[model samples]
Target chain A: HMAQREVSDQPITLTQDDVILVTGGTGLFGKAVEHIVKKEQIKGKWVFLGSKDGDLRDADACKQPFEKYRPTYVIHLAAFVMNFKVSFWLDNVNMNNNILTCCYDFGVKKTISCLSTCVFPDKIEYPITEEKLHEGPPHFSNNAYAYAKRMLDMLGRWYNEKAVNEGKSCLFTSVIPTNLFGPHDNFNVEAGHVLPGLMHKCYKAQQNGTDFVVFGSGKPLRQFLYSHDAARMLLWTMFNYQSEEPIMLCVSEEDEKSIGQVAQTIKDAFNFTGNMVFDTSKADGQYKKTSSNAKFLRLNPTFQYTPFEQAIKETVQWFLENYETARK
Target chain B: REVSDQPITLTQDDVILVTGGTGLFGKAVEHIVKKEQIKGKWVFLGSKDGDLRDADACKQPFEKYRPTYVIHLAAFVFKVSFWLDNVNMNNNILTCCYDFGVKKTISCLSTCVFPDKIEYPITEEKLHEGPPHFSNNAYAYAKRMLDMLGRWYNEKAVNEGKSCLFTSVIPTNLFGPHDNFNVEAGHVLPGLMHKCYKAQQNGTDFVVFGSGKPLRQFLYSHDAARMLLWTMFNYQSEEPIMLCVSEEDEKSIGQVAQTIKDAFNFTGNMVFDTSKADGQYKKTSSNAKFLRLNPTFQYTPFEQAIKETVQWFLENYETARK
Candidate 1:
């Protein structure tokens, strides 16, 4: 009955009556939100669904939680991602389909699914804006996964449009974020991202008293968002940001740090006096993946990001304390 | 992979299964294959067969027929329901084809489904150049994925020193025998076919919705099916080829209306309302890629195809999907 209510363009406010569900609730962004919610005392009952909860690809498994939780809002953050496996496309596609459909079926008021900046075209202009998402084909390496994520935006906008036309109230939207880092991140030296993997490697080097060997010439540039800052943006978006266009949750284009700059930042965070050497043998993939957060900044004119160095320091501290339990 | 310029040597052991076997193009393909009496075993399956969205159910037909070749023409939206159905059904078909070791597979794409802002005379390369019109992004993305899935799997297979080619074909607006003739949900040419017939019966003005100046390249189902079949056996590229009439064959809605009117010999006034909105002015797709590969092939003339389509609509008015 509530799902069919006419929704105005007015901003939504969270209250104790609201039940918020975060899929991939145990990951870095989810954990950040969890910490912020408790720390900030945000008014909403939150349920974080971890992989241990159930497989999201299964419609029944995904739906059972919605039925049980009766979530008024959902932050769909789960994804099965990889470039190599055939499972990447099917797994993520099915999971995303199930989550969005379940959100509609349960009449959730607002669902903000997460999308990645990598969803943009491989051949594109720099300072990639949100509009160029489907402008061209994404790079071939991770397209299966990229395409799966891209459809999330399409399905979200479609669901909202259909609901509005059919006199229903499913306000499903998505957020596109740039490279994410911080505490509770995937830190596997082989597969993790540049930041967390470097932190993990640096930690090992610190303990073993060996050289901190960085991959590539450390010249490639990237934009990194600390998980907690990303969480703040997502929480702000769930209510304040309302549009069919997916907002790119990223730092400004000017703040991008070269791989060399980030590596030195990590060295400083660890206070490592050891040699931090670049191999110069491995590929420096895409010298720059600079993204513009003009829309996000324009919308949230006063939004602030945690200083990169401080965020890295805190993440290093967390890694040092939780190395035994952290994902590596 | 070497493309066979000659017709593939088919035997009784080579089974060709058409997924959307009972629909417009499927029936057309069926009619051609039956009359030609090709040596391969052909199984035409439609929605009536089973739920193709189900993984196990999708695999059922492949196991039963043990198909060596497949023509996937199934896509759905009745947006969320259709998107889910289409995405799952498409995935299952491609996945099963790979799992069952089906030699070759081809899926279908459409000209209208390409990006809203694209180069004129769109080619296969322009598919992802920009966002498709927002009207049907759900359907567009799913079909686009068929191309991506095929390309991805093809690359993966090649890296492993194996051969697995799953390609797609983009055809312009098609109309003919066994087409959806509904005036509402159906497409332009077929919808007008039904509308013209009804107007003739009711003795009313044949009212066209919008300014009938929109340019279109309509392919006959029979011609399209033949091209698709040819592509199935001989066209080896993993990339999609536009199966359409020559750019010189493009016709305006006004021309098509007059042709349909002539076919029925209707003497009524044909009126085009300026108040109603028209679809995109033109989204011309080049068949240069298709023609270069199959140089000797010829298309049935537009007026003739329209004439046949009008005849079929009148004859099957009772049973045709209106």
Candidate 2:
């Protein structure tokens, strides 16, 4: 946000270009950013980044590219979660810590790291607030990944504090996005997460003329967001909000719906004619998980979050045409 | 003499590398290995290998030897136990294990890793679960670091299916031929052994450090050797099994000191120095882990083992320069 204050509408007064090195350039968020940068025609350097390669297990993997690009801004989406083993938490934290340290060390004006709602503590009373992060232990299933991310958030804050004392303009921030589905996604049944997994299951069930079995009475609630919407909020956060600490970004919990409601919407959109059975024996994790919008909304007074229904439809249409081959 | 029931064969040709190769336990292990001829190469790599304090020293040995197994007895100890010293040494050992990727590491650990107020019969699970005993803060801190490192390594090995493993053998108050007898450096047993021996020789009053009531478990060198060798072969997990027990101990401190006086044929009255602080509390770990891990494993009978150790100490006293 301090970066925006440095900018003005007066054309010829004075200005310097902002260069941002965005990691994970080939993934969903990276593509979205490329498209946005093209549309805005911003005359600043944009360096696209891929994985840290095998060095995701090593902290020093971050140093090479950081020293090479030396950009004024950094967008760190490079973290091992979802697909990684549960025990790689420490290595993951070490890698992200290295990134943050390099960002501060290089005097980067502002840096943004994408945090997942998966990092939230397991339990939720009503609407979750940033204060509740690391409240208790996180869900066991997600513990390793979430703890690593949470520690990374703390490391960012520590880096910022050290930077402030040194009179540096380095501002490290984070945006915690809720469950995302859109564009590039895992279609592999074993590894694909909820949104695409469900979509794949339903599509396969339709093809086979069999009943789609849902788990746990389909009663647990979830909030869904298109990856682009989530990415946009992150970009806006980097450009428009600057805090000495990381930020927690999530959709309003009131807007969340039960799994059954989500399934019905998908069924209606696809017009699927198949038997659906809700299985009560399987697990339903986290009865309710929603975020507090108080801090985030204050930062963006006029911003409008995307409507889930519309986003879902657009994704459904996109998948209908591309998913069959997109998976391969 | 080191033969176990396991099917694994440790031939005389197998190369064995011992870290912290100059320490007391390192010498004991080397002595056993030499007598057994159970390997191809027996190499001692110590600080000359690199700084154990760096937490990365094991890497060089790991690369040079690609050791099939490591007896990672490396540790740092302050002249007197304290808290700050514990943290530094603990961090050091863990960092080395993680960096070097030692597949099979058997650390020489202590009971000091446990917290102070736990109930009797402590198990491996009780480690890192509570506060450590205050008097042994320095030593406990370092040992706890080793425990955590073992946990981290196990988590990694299980997830990755890496052959990496870490196991510790907890020996309580070890006494043997090479045990330090210095009041500042040696444990209570050996240090007391020295005082009782000297008092008997000089015909002077035997003064003990503290009140003679505080109880503790002491494992003899050869029994500890047997347990650790058994552990290295069968204890395939990451955590150490505490091999000492309260049942092995019956003689109080006064009784043990008096027996030493009798053994040496001395006629001196033993006096308990109650003014000195009698350390926190006494405890011994449960042998459920040892029993479960090695159901058929047997410990040396306590009295026979103590006599053997005492005889060895007497013969070796001429060489114990200090």
Candidate 3:
């Protein structure tokens, strides 16, 4: 495969301090990355940016950050994340193309863009590995986002091909992380992901002394990764892992949990005694959309994941402490 | 399924625009629309329209015509190291179509976009069953994205409760007037046509490359053009419609050469070169979807189509794209 082909045998050299720019730096994963970098004391000059940097959708404006920062490496987590908007399709295609192209032109040494499990084929077997990324169509509802993300994978592969074929050693790769939740996540009831949205709803329900209503039957299962864990894995990819193919930074299949388990964990985290209800009329997206992290485990055998219960506790605490400023 | 079956009335105020309007398919479409008197004012855009790679340049033509309906046949002609170029142009044109609010846009794709390894009688449903051949990955992926965009655009339109349809048409190897007659870059039919024309002019035996046994399904550009119009007018699904000759119409390379020879009226002996490569034995695609929908449609006979194409080539030799 294109990803397995070695671009260079020369070891990547790192100075005591090199500039690293993280686009979409105020988002959930970006914030966790900020926490990891400071806590681990990984050597680099880190630049974390919010939307004030510029609209990545505009080609000319996208160049401003690269010019100003002159980053030697980039963690491109910037993308339009939503569904069912007419402009979403064009916005994502333009932004991703702009950022990656500029990085290529400006000669960034390494870039690790973030992708989601939603980009996988809609009709796929369990344990979806990196090989099955383009096996079929992504789910119809989120095709715009899915195709745009798939293009990122294709673009990175093509970029590496050109770089290596021309005898350059620049590493441009992406990571396909599963659903994420933690501090700085969108907690809006209408727009947020399941876990964060439930966290918010549970908090409101407990305070009002009402029953917590969960969408769907709560039988569907998922392999949820904490943002901090995803952050650590991404940083590992930046410094160690080298390939054009995307790696799935997810919890092992054995650790997969059901929605009911997640809701119970959240309820316990909040220490609430309220009743819980599952609305069967609501839609359950899929029965099981499992992915294999065997590649990741094989690469880093000794790495440990944060316990699910502890992760939920920390997330609940963070939400409680920063309730006013937390995004909803 | 996203397209509405409800008939939309065409009015004199509706202008129809064709991109890549000077190419073989565009010319065929122009020929039929003019001869058949299809409704609305027609504008055929050529390269002089501007570089479509530039977003503003693509948007200019849309804004100029304000087309309620668009027949998007324009694509960047293939060149060496042009995979990315082709992909970017496809994105640009589709983006422009959506942004300009074209009521019903039908773009063009090819059988090359189908997966590299596929079952016999390739169907539209199996277009994304696997990866395309690596040799044509760049162009194939670009065309696949065009279909993806069409579906997404259709979904968004329906969500907004609009009747506009953005779809695509996939045709088999197309041959006719306004084709590239270059033996090196063109498809088998045109290449053979060019070789026979030269052999007759030079008074030498015509040479057929390889064993001339590979089976292929070829569609005349005029037939393809007629179907594209039908798709524009009546085909109501966001899914692409494949324009192909039926399986019974499959012809061997040797048969194709014989027809070309007959068209040129060359009685000289023909030689088959055995050392050359015969690519794939057969890449048969089913036209069942088209047949199932438009059961009464007719295809011009292969020999008749070849005779007309050869006559056009001989008459316009000085100006043909050889």
- C-alpha positional error of residue B57 in candidate 3 after TM-score superposition, expressed in Å: 1.9
Candidate 1 local lDDT, A157-258, one digit each (tens)? 778877887787778878887888988999999989878889988999999999998897998878889899999999888877657677888887688898
Instruction: List model 3 lDDT by residue over A1-328, tens digit each.
Output: 5435323344455566688989899999999999999998878789997888799988899999889988889999988872564466678877887888878778888999988888888888888899888888888777778888887787777777777776766778988888888999999989899999999999999999999999979999999999999999888788777877789999988899999999999999999898999999988878987899988898778999999999999999999999999998
State the lDDT of candidate 2 residue by residue for A1-328, as single tens digits: 2455421233321124666888776576676677667776655788887764436444466677767767888888877652444335545655675677678778888888877766666655757776666455456576667656765676566566667677877878777766777766666655776666666777778888887766658888877767767776777776666554556556666777777877777676677888778887877876876667677677666767777777767767777888756552
Task: Count clashes in each candidate, considering only residues at least 3 apart in sequence or on different chains.
Answer: 3, 7, 0
Worst lDDT window (10 residues) for model 3 chain B?
B75-84
- 2 against 3, candidate with superior lDDT: 3
Tell me the TM-score of chain B in each candidate: 0.95, 0.82, 0.94
Candidate 3 positional error at B297, Å: 2.6
Output DockQ, candidate 2. 0.04
**Against the correct fold, how does model 3 do in TM-score?**
0.92
Error of 1 at A86 (Å): 3.1
Best by TM-score: 3
Error of 1 at A148 (Å): 1.2
Tens-digit per-residue lDDT, B1-322, candidate 1: 4366675667989998888878889989988887788678899897777899999889889889999998998877447776778888988998888877778899998765788877788888888776778667778877888788887777767776665678988877878999998899998888888889899999999988899998888899999989988887798888789988887888999999899999999999999987999877876788888877889998999989998888887877889898
Write down the lDDT that model 2 would get: 0.66
Model 2 clash pairs? A1-A241, A1-A242, B12-B39, B13-B39, B13-B40, B14-B39, B14-B40
How many Å off is the CA of B3 in candidate 1?
2.2
Q: Pick the candidate with the highest DockQ.
A: 1
